[PDB]
Design a binder for this molecule. Structure first.
Ligand SMILES: Nc1nc2c(ncn2[C@@H]2O[C@H](COP(=O)(O)OP(=O)(O)OP(=O)(O)O)[C@@H](O)[C@H]2O)c(=O)[nH]1
Ligand SMILES: Nc1nc2c(ncn2[C@@H]2O[C@H](COP(=O)(O)OP(=O)(O)OP(=O)(O)O)[C@@H](O)[C@H]2O)c(=O)[nH]1
Ligand SMILES: [Mg+2]
Ligand SMILES: [Mg+2]
Ligand SMILES: [Mg+2]
Ligand SMILES: [Mg+2]
Ligand SMILES: [Mg+2]
Ligand SMILES: [Mg+2]
Lengths: 133, 133
């Protein structure tokens, strides 16, 4: 079974927004981009819009699709789509994550993050308007 | 709920674009689509598209930029299509799988029998091809 996930890139003077995965639903303590599973019936955009609302409290406008990749966490097959999020109402707050943080993107290189992101960190940096090395 | 990730490519020839007529017995029969297919276990979208284009077109293709993602449910079976721009390949495509192959003016899509999943986003497609609507 494939699990299509959508997730977003939010931005603050070059910084980027990540959330600390909470301790009970686990890839615990790992830093990710906000987003989640697409529900039966919805489009990718609708799903991100919604996930961003329910996770950050923000009312977002979903921008360009930047990236897609696959990963296996065992038998569990996930497909992430990453979207640029230029525009929203309100400021985000930790409705789901342990912490929210605006970090320099460079810092991702030494932050505990999903192997699905770790494996494409270069592709990510590019999609953000930065070079890998 | 349940999902089938598909990868499909945009190949172009002096402005025209390449579609295949779905075979009569493996069916959404008679319908014109962009070549591609289902992603297998362990492969990246790119890997799957390179492979599909080989086994369907006979071409060794280089998979370029990701242009579109969309969802469609054909009743119970849930589909996620990623569309990639295919700029570079070795050889000329031949109908290894499809009933027929054709390079059409993209405008013609408006009056070709195409998957409802593509018809719903024809707007978004024209943009990804660099055209108007
Ligand atoms: N949100 C998010 N998920 C990621 C990322 N990288 C990999 N994933 C995986 O995508 C899957 C689905 O994301 P979730 O946030 O758990 O889905 P959700 O609907 O938002 O929340 P729950 O299903 O209740 O856990 C998880 O297994 C994540 O580990 C990422 O950068 N952001
Ligand atoms: N290839 C392709 N599939 C599309 C398109 N639009 C919707 N689809 C659906 O995507 C699904 C999978 O594509 P297929 O090409 O049939 O899968 P395949 O691996 O290439 O070949 P099969 O195993 O025989 O199905 C089908 O159910 C199509 O209905 C399109 O533009 N191109
Ligand atoms: Mg969620
Ligand atoms: Mg989430
Ligand atoms: Mg959810
Ligand atoms: Mg095929
Ligand atoms: Mg096919
Ligand atoms: Mg196939």
């Amino acid at each position: 079974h494939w699990i299509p996930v959508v997730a977003g890139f939010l931005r603050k003077d070059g910084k980027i927004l990540v959330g600390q995965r909470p301790e009970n639903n686990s890839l615990a303590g790992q830093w990710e981009f906000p987003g989640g599973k697409i529900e039966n019936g919805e489009t990718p955009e609708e799903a991100l819009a919604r996930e961003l609302n329910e996770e950050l409290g923000i009312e977002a406008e979903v921008g360009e699709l930047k990236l897609a990749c696959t990963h296996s966490y065992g038998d569990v097959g996930i497909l992430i789509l990453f979207y640029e999020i230029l525009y929203w109402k309100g400021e985000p707050r930790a409705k789901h994550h342990m912490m929210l943080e605006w970090i320099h993107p460079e810092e991702l290189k030494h932050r505990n993050i999903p192997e699905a992101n770790r494996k494409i960190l270069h592709k990510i940096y590019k999609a953000l308007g930065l070079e890998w090395r």
